[PDB]
């Protein structure tokens, strides 16, 4: 290789937080073969990407402007403001104008075309052949009541992104030699057996078992388990799933390797324990912790695969099946129907998930007939993209690489606006791929390299998992490495800054927990020991500036040490604030970040992202619900950072105005708080209007996701009336709509009023609107549960959102469901709010 060529890889390992050149936890070479496989997709995308547009990463959309934003234009005229050091004139522009065209109405409007419209304060450019109506920064300014401000400077040089020179009819059988574990002790001794499953997409094709034996630290069976399934009938992607019950341990082994070879030989597999169903149960990875983990020893010595029209009455039976939801389980009668009428079923794209579930993958002939099916894919290829539908073929139920490829094909048609909407959920879906190299993993690689913004979030989503998941770190590390070798040195330098900063601060956060008590208050000497520590970093240690990971436009600078503090709260997070490093920023307002170690933030990532998806859904139907899905990024193990929404206050704090007598509660208080922070009465009604939309948006969203029973303490409001929920780490109430909220709506329980009439109207509007996307939400939820929780009932915890979205019912009933829910909160008032307290003391 080379002296400095290996110094490149030690930079790569530092950003990844894992060494992909390590081979100490492999029993084959799939991971290294995947490093080599991804060189091509990388070099292709890099080689065909526009240098100019890659440097500026214009964030842009082809969707129509919503109805709720053409109301803020009674005149077909939008206001932009071009800047230059001191002075800065304003310019009349029509929504359909272009970056180039408004430069035509600036220079010629004055009485050399190699300048650019960058945004004031950020690294966000208005460029490329798009209308300004169709730029995200512009839609954002219109949405808030802000005015588009812009500075004129030289385009950033493409030179800075340049990339370095790169680098049988025999039945199947397995011998169970035995198991071994250095130490087991609990208290009393039991018996133990090994269960072997041939598995394919959460379908057990076959299952044999050992005789049981006593659970000493070594147990030897020496037994052949003859299976019924024949070798030729083994499908690519099938897993030998070895499990130990007395269900304490599990491990998996792909029966057909990444070169289509039948798996053969002597394996010692180090196994995962079960924490006192989910995506960790599917992994081909073995436990790296070889000193403590349980190990199984096996032997393979077994290569391969090298007219008439329906009666109208069955069609109805078949259509009914196809209509049902992604969780509605299929009977044997239903599957056989689907399969017998394959070709009719292929005419309905929505039937696809249900159809490929009806396939007997445990049979060679039928899989082949299934490949004949996928070969005449005219209707699918021509169908309009359905993200819900496409996602379903990427979940844990589908292990066939061709099935999964027809789904990835549909994704290729997404523009970058929609990729960012689904990116986190597509990164989690790499967990369900049988092989490390996959159409999906490559699709992300390709989309990330093509767009600096997708690239940026693909970095942190990958790194979040690598840091806190032994089950999938090696796979994701290989994928990240591939990204980093093609993202270009501007982005590598950027990440290196970001990784350095957060490593310095997490250090400070862990070092501060320990000097404070397990829990009480915040010491005089502890705010002493926070300021001192950050003064030492600030000088010769911290970058002059780093990219804010949750908002990669914004460049944070030097710390505002006076405003930083440890938080009198759960597990001593740091409230930090930074100066903005861009001197053309039009405000002296700091960037606020919380650093927390203790909670599990991947869950918050996931919930906030589904919340961003609901906003986008409501966009399809002219519905704005003023949600504040604030930034939130997991960076490492049980730890990460959070955006501080400026001017926000906990609802429980507004109730603790005085005393707050261990849980005193009072209807009228919220409304008084709103008038104090609103210098004109005019802005006060703007706040109540904002509170009715926001309260409604967070009510509907929260009912649907089953996270609505919350303390006042985890709900906030801005000075401008924008309500929002926080801290999604996990008698009853479907959601929070307490008497304090209702007095803002001019209604003190058991009445109706103009502002409350809006609230109900908006709620049912929002609720029926999410139901036009029932299959999407069910599948995102089901996946959320599987890749981002503890262990969970693959039927029962998902089955909440069915009943929440009132599946199978007509629209009138559905409204009547939700409207009962509102009146459950108003029939209970404070009962549950007060109840959180009763346990405590
Ligand atoms: C005297 S004190 O300085 O200690 N004071 C006490 C009362 N605090 C109220 C808050 C608690 C809080 N927790 C979180 C959080 C905690 C853990 C996990 C989380 N996931 N998402 C948020 C979040 N995120 C917060 N946000 C997010 C949105 O932007 C405003 C700050 C706030 S604000 C402020 C601090």
Tokens of 409: 């094909």
- How many Å lie between the centroid of ligand 1 and the Cα of residue 515? 21
**Nearest residue by C-alpha to atom 3 in ligand 1:** 567
- How many Å lie between the centroid of ligand 1 and the Cα of residue 23? 42
At what resolution in Å was this solved? Answer: 2.8
Opening angle at CA 444, ends 443 and 446, nearest 5: 65
CA distance 126 to 138: 9
Q: What spatial distance separates the first Cα and last Cα of the chain, rounded to whole Å?
A: 65
Tokens of 536: 């030492």
Nearest to 380 by CA among 405, 346, 354, 355: 346
- Write b or e for each residue in 672-702: b if 16 or more Cβ atoms lie within 10 A of its Cβ, otherwise e: ebbeebbeeeebbeebbebbbbbbbbbbbbb
Pocket of ligand 1 contains residue 599 by CB under 6 Å: yes
**Nearest residue by C-alpha to atom 32 in ligand 1:** 726
CA dihedral sign, ordered 289, 427, 277, 633: positive
- Residues sharing a CB contact under 8 Å with residue 642, sequence separation 6 or more, in sequence order: 550, 593, 594, 595, 596, 601, 604, 630, 631, 632
Is the Cβ–Cβ distance between 152 and 115 less than 8 Å?
Answer: yes
Nearest to 505 by CA among 537, 528, 532, 531: 537
Q: Which CATH architecture has domain 168-302?
A: Sandwich (2.60)
Atom of ligand 1 nearest to the CA of 568: 4
CA distance 507 to 472: 25
**Cα-based distances in Å from 273 to 184, 251, 293:** 11, 9, 8
Nearest to 625 by CA among 701, 706, 516: 701
What is the per-residue DSSP string for 299-320?
EE-----------HHHHHHHHH
Binding site for ATP: what residues are annotated? 592-601, 627-635, 724-730
Every domain of the chain and the residues it spans: 1-166, 168-302, 303-488, 489-646, 647-834
**Cα-based distances in Å from 746 to 446, 486, 719:** 53, 57, 19
The CATH code belonging to domain 1-166 is 3.10.20.90
Element counts in the chain: helices (H) and strands (E): 31, 25
- Is it true that 1-166 and 489-646 share their CATH fold? no
- Technique employed here was X-ray
Estimate to the nearest angstrom the gap between the alpha carbon of 241 and the chain centroid: 28
- Residues sharing a CB contact under 8 Å with residue 125, sequence separation 6 or more, in sequence order: 56, 57, 58, 116, 117, 118, 119
> Residue 311: exposed, middle, or buried by beta-carbon count in 10 A (0-12, 13-18, 19+)?
exposed
> For the chain, what is the radius of gyration of the CA atoms?
29
Pick the CATH number of 489-646 from 3.40.50.10860, 3.10.450.50, 3.30.1010.10, 1.10.287.1080: 3.30.1010.10
Phi, psi of 623 (to 5 degrees): -115, 115
| Helix orientation angle between 39-47 and 30-37, rounded to the nearest 10 degrees | 20
What is the per-residue DSSP string for 619-638?
HTTT---------EEEEETT
Neighbouring C-beta atoms of residue 264, cutoff 10 Å: 12
Is the Cβ–Cβ distance between 770 and 704 less than 8 Å?
Answer: yes
**Nearest residue by C-alpha to atom 1 in ligand 1:** 568
- Write b or e for each residue in 627-648: b if 16 or more Cβ atoms lie within 10 A of its Cβ, otherwise e: bbbbbbbbbbeebbbbbbbeeb
- How many Å lie between the centroid of ligand 1 and the Cα of residue 716? 9
Tokens of 704: 């649907």
Pocket of ligand 1 contains residue 645 by CB under 6 Å: yes
Tokens of 317: 């039976």
Q: Among 577, 594, 714, which is best to mutate for testing ligand 1, by the most ligand atoms less than 8 A from CB?
A: 594
Q: Is 451 helix (H, G, I), strand (E, B) or coil?
A: coil
Atom of ligand 1 nearest to the CA of 596: 17
Domain 647-834 has CATH 3.30.70.260: no
- How many Å lie between the centroid of ligand 1 and the Cα of residue 551? 18
The CATH code belonging to domain 303-488 is 1.25.40.70
Pocket of ligand 1 contains residue 567 by CB under 6 Å: yes
Neighbouring C-beta atoms of residue 314, cutoff 10 Å: 13
**Cα-based distances in Å from 589 to 82, 505, 645, 732:** 21, 21, 12, 41
- How many Å lie between the centroid of ligand 1 and the Cα of residue 633? 15
**Nearest residue by C-alpha to atom 15 in ligand 1:** 727
Give the helix/strand (H/E) hosting 593. strand 591-597
Estimate to the nearest angstrom the gap between the alpha carbon of 783 and the chain centroid: 10
Pocket of ligand 1 contains residue 490 by CB under 6 Å: no
Q: For 312, left (φ over 0), alpha (ψ -120 to 50), or beta? A: alpha
């Amino acid at each position: 290789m080379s002296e400095e060529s290996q110094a490149f890889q030690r930079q790569l390992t530092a950003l990844i937080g894992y060494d992909v050149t390590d081979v100490s936890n492999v029993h084959d070479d799939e991971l290294e073969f995947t490093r080599r496989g991804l060189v091509t997709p990388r070099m292709a995308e890099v080689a065909s990407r526009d240098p100019k547009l890659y440097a500026m990463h214009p964030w842009v959309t082809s969707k129509p402007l919503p109805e709720y934003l053409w109301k803020k234009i009674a005149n077909n005229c939008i206001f932009i403001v071009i800047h230059r050091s001191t002075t800065s004139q304003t310019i009349k522009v029509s929504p359909d104008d272009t970056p180039g065209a408004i430069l035509q109405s600036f220079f010629t409007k004055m009485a050399e075309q190699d300048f650019v419209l960058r945004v004031c304060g950020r690294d966000e450019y208005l460029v490329g052949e798009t209308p300004i109506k169709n730029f995200q920064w512009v839609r954002h300014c219109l949405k808030n009541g802000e005015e588009i401000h812009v500075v004129l400077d030289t385009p950033p040089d493409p030179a800075l992104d340049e990339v370095r020179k790169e680098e049988c009819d025999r039945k199947f059988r397995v011998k169970i030699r035995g198991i071994d574990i250095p130490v087991l002790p609990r208290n009393t001794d039991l018996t133990v057996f090994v269960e072997a499953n041939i598995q394919h997409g959460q379908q057990v094709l076959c299952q044999r078992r050992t005789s049981p034996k006593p659970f000493t630290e070594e147990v030897l069976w020496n037994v052949w388990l003859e299976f019924s399934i024949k070798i030729k009938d083994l499908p690519k992607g099938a897993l030998l799933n070895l499990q130990i019950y007395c269900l304490l341990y599990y491990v998996n082994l792909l029966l057909i390797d990444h070169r289509f070879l039948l798996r053969r030989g002597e394996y010692v597999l180090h196994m995962w324990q079960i924490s006192g169903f989910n995506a960790d149960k599917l992994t081909s990875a073995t436990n790296p912790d070889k000193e403590n983990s349980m190990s199984i020893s096996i032997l393979l010595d077994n290569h391969p695969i090298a007219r008439a029209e329906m009666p109208n009455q069955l069609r109805k039976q078949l259509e009914a099946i196809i209509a049902t939801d992604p969780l509605n389980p299929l009977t044997a009668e239903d599957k056989e129907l689907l399969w017998h009428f394959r070709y009719e079923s292929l005419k309905h794209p929505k039937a696809y998930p249900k159809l490929f579930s009806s396939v007997k993958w445990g049979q060679q002939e039928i899989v082949a007939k299934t490949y004949q099916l996928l070969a005449r894919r005219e209707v699918w290829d021509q169908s309009a993209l359905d993200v819900g539908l496409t996602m379903q073929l990427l979940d844990c139920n589908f292990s066939d690489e061709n099935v999964r490829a027809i789904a990835v094909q549909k994704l290729e048609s997404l523009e970058d606006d929609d990729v960012l909407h689904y990116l986190l959920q597509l990164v989690q879906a790499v967990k369900f791929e049988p092989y490390h190299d996959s159409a999906l993993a490559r699709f992300l690689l390709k989309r990330g390299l093509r767009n600096k913004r997708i690239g940026h979030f693909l970095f942190w989503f990958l790194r979040s998992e690598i840091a806190q998941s032994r089950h999938y770190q090696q796979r994701f590390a290989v994928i990240l490495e591939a990204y980093l070798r093609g993202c270009g040195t501007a982005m590598l330098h950027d990440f290196t800054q970001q990784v350095q900063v957060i490593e310095m601060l997490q250090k400070v956060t862990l070092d501060i927990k320990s000097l404070s008590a397990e829990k009480y208050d915040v010491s005089s000497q502890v705010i002493s020991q926070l300021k001192q520590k950050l003064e030492n970093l600030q000088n010769s240690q911290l970058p002059e500036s780093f990219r804010v990971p949750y908002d990669p436009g914004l460049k944070a600078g030097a710390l505002a040490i006076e405003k930083c503090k440890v938080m009198a709260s759960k597990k001593k997070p740091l409230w930090l604030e930074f100066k903005c490093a861009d001197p053309t920023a039009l405000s002296n307002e700091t960037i606020g970040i919380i650093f927390k170690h203790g909670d599990d933030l991947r869950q918050d990532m996931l919930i906030l992202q589904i919340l961003r998806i609901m906003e986008s859904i409501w966009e399809t139907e002219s519905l704005d619900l003023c949600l504040l899905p604030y930034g939130c990024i997991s960076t490492g193990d049980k730890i990460g950072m959070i955006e501080i929404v400026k001017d926000a206050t906990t609802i429980a704090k507004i109730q603790q105005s005085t005393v707050g007598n261990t849980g005193a509660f009072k209807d009228e208080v919220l409304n008084h708080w709103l008038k104090e922070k609103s210098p004109t009465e005019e802005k006060f009604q703007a706040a109540v209007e904002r509170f009715v939309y926001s309260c409604a948006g967070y009510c509907v969203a929260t009912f649907v996701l089953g996270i609505g029973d919350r303390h006042n303490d985890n709900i906030m409001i801005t000075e401008t009336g924008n309500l929002f929920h926080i801290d999604f780490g996990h008698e009853r109430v479907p959601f929070v709509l307490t008497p304090d909220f209702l007095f803002v709506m001019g209604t003190s329980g058991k009445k109706t009023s103009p502002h409350f009439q809006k609230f109900q109207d908006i709620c049912v509007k929002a609720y029926l609107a999410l139901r036009h996307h029932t299959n999407l939400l069910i599948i995102l939820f089901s996946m959320m549960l599987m890749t981002g929780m503890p262990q969970l009932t693959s039927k029962e915890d998902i089955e909440y959102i069915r009943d929440a979205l009132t599946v199978g019912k007509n629209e009138e009933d559905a409204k009547k469901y939700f409207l009962d829910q509102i009146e459950v909160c108003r029939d209970k008032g404070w009962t549950v709010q007060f109840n959180w307290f009763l346990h405590l003391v």
